[PDB]
Amino acid sequence: DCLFKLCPMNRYSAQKQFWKAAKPGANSTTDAVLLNKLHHAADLEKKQNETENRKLLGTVIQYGNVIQLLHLKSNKYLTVNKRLPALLEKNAMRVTLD
Amino acid sequence: LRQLEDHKRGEALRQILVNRYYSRGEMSLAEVQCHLDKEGASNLVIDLI
Amino acid sequence: MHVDRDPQEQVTPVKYARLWSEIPSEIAIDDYDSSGASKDEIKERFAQTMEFVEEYLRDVVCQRFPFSDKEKNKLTFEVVNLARNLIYFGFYNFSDLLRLTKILLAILDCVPEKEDIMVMDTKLKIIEILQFILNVRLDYRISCLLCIFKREFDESNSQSPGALDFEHIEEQAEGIFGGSEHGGRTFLRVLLHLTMHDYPPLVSGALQLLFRHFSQRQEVLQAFKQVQLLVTSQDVDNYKQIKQDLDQLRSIVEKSESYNYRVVKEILIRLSKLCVQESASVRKSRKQQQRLLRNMGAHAVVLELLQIPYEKAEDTKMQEIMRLAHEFLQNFCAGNQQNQALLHKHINLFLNPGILEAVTMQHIFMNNFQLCSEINERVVQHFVHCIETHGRNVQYIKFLQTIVKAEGKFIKKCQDMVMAELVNSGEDVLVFYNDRASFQTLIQMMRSERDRMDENSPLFMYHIHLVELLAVCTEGKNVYTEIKCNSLLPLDDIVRVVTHEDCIPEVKIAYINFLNHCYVDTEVEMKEIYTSNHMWKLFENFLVDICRACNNTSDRKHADSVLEKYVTEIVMSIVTTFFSSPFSDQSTTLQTRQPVFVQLLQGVFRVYHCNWLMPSQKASVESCIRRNIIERLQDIVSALEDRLRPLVQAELSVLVDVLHRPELLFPENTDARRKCESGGFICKLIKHTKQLLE
What we know:
Chain A: Residues 58-98 form the MIR domain. Chain A has 98 residues and is an alpha+beta fold. Helices cover 29% and strands 12% of the residues of chain A.
């Protein structure tokens, strides 16, 4: 359970755009051209995100950079979301796995 | 006629002030900048930034 | 020894808050409102002294034409120190220091090496008093401006038009500013001479004085804009405590770290007590009289305190100030829309917390109509995901009951703002109840204890007690969505029988007004008959409860409200006499007439008002058989700022001309001009400019 694998910084630019545009809030706006190109851009961004992880394979880390922990047996990064407080301690900031 | 009468009265006030407060050399943009650099206006900017 | 500040103190001449008692007088520089200085006990002790400095300076301008550094300056410094200290305590008329300065300027222009410190200090004191004299003619000019404004306005007064005033503003503007033939042309010559010098801090004051001489019209316009804060002709202290508390507030906003902290709570209490302004009164002749008076600019000062420079959000000294500041800000915009629309531009500060900063939005939107109808696609939709992920807030949930919901029927276009959250909320925060809602929830609420158990925080049922928000938004008259709202709704006919299983008065009130708003909405409702035959049963067993509560001898309050709420149902759409809706047969007509008369009898017999008694009688009977100066000063300052365009031409051009003028008949000599004109005046100007950053 306890093993965590280290990672470099992962850019989330088009992925967050796709997650924002893919959830129908009020207008339920869908597009055969805009959403398809947005999904293609997000996939290309994820691919070029992965292609530099193998480039940064042996590299020491100093105190002060972003480190992006990854759970090994779950293949699930642990995240801290600003909006949602903790369930038990009701003055806190909850951690999850995404 | 809004921007013209204001220009006329501004020019009149300017001329009144000029003849109140008063071989003149020629002026141009090409000469005032090198004159200001000769007196050292570059150093003021490069030290103030 | 003579300026020991026993009877007096230094007073600035640019003071504000003028009155109506001295402005009807149009006199020149000879006389003022005070007509001099303090009383006749101290002026004779200095009258023989005042002539001494004038005679000494008139001798100095006589035989000190080249210069003096031979201990004569060792007396001129003391005499100008005495002169400066007598200027600042206000023992002069304007006709005297003008005479002093028209000869004082003539003693310097009679024309990196180290020089004498002594004359440096003398010149510093004299440029300080030259800085002072420009600040007293400003007050005279402003005084003359509103004096002539009052006399021309009251010459053509239409109150107990303005076109006659507009033909004089340009005349006086071109008369008293320019177009003459007040030092003159030689005023600037000594300023340039003092600017071209060594490197003192004196040249900073001289250059500030030079920039003060120019740019005169825009600064007198700004001062005249600022000084118009007229009050009801008393002003003995009324503006004074607000001003000194604002200055006290000026030192406790930037850094609170702790002598400054102990003042904040007290000064916020004092400001809130001044702002509430006898709320138990009529709130018209006392609140509105002083309401515009702190609208002089004291709006963002509290917001700068509220901008949280410190972020220690633990259990600490935050809560001693923030609740009080929030309460003061609620008292700031409770009057009308003038402050409400002004604070409406700062709605980006009260978004995320939902606990203390949501009370601002909660209370600011009481009864406005043209401000809360301009809500964009971002304000109310910010709280769609803030209802989730933060629990259910009883304090917050009353806010959207006011901004959007209803005063009767509020509006149709904001129904898409308020109803689209139901389909956007995948959590479906609006649930009805569970299967154990009969007694496992309602036995603790008011069957246990009254008085709302220390301000209405149950976290469970008031979130479902405030479902009148869901009830009356589109059920008033809107035909936006009927199927969409009713699909996720608690399916009205089913939820009636769990209400009669165990009756709770507040939930009963919410259910009956929800059902009443549902029924009287539209005539295009598809199903009516089985909604009509079943509402007869609830009407019967609720009239039974009304008759049961009627036996109480005016010892209840919920029943009276319930009866009034049910009065509209009786006065609502009439009953039907089709196959369904049995037409008030023996089982139906025997309870809607006999038992309804007693219901109104208690109200008539009690102290209840007749506003709702009449509808019951009509429905029961029917159902049986079946100070202009504030705008004036704004107009004047608008017309005064209309002429700003020629000011730029009259200002910038003469500035760039006189900076192109170092040498033009200055004394037109030879010895004092080859140092003056060598391209070195601007050199020394920018050499001093880089040294003033520190």
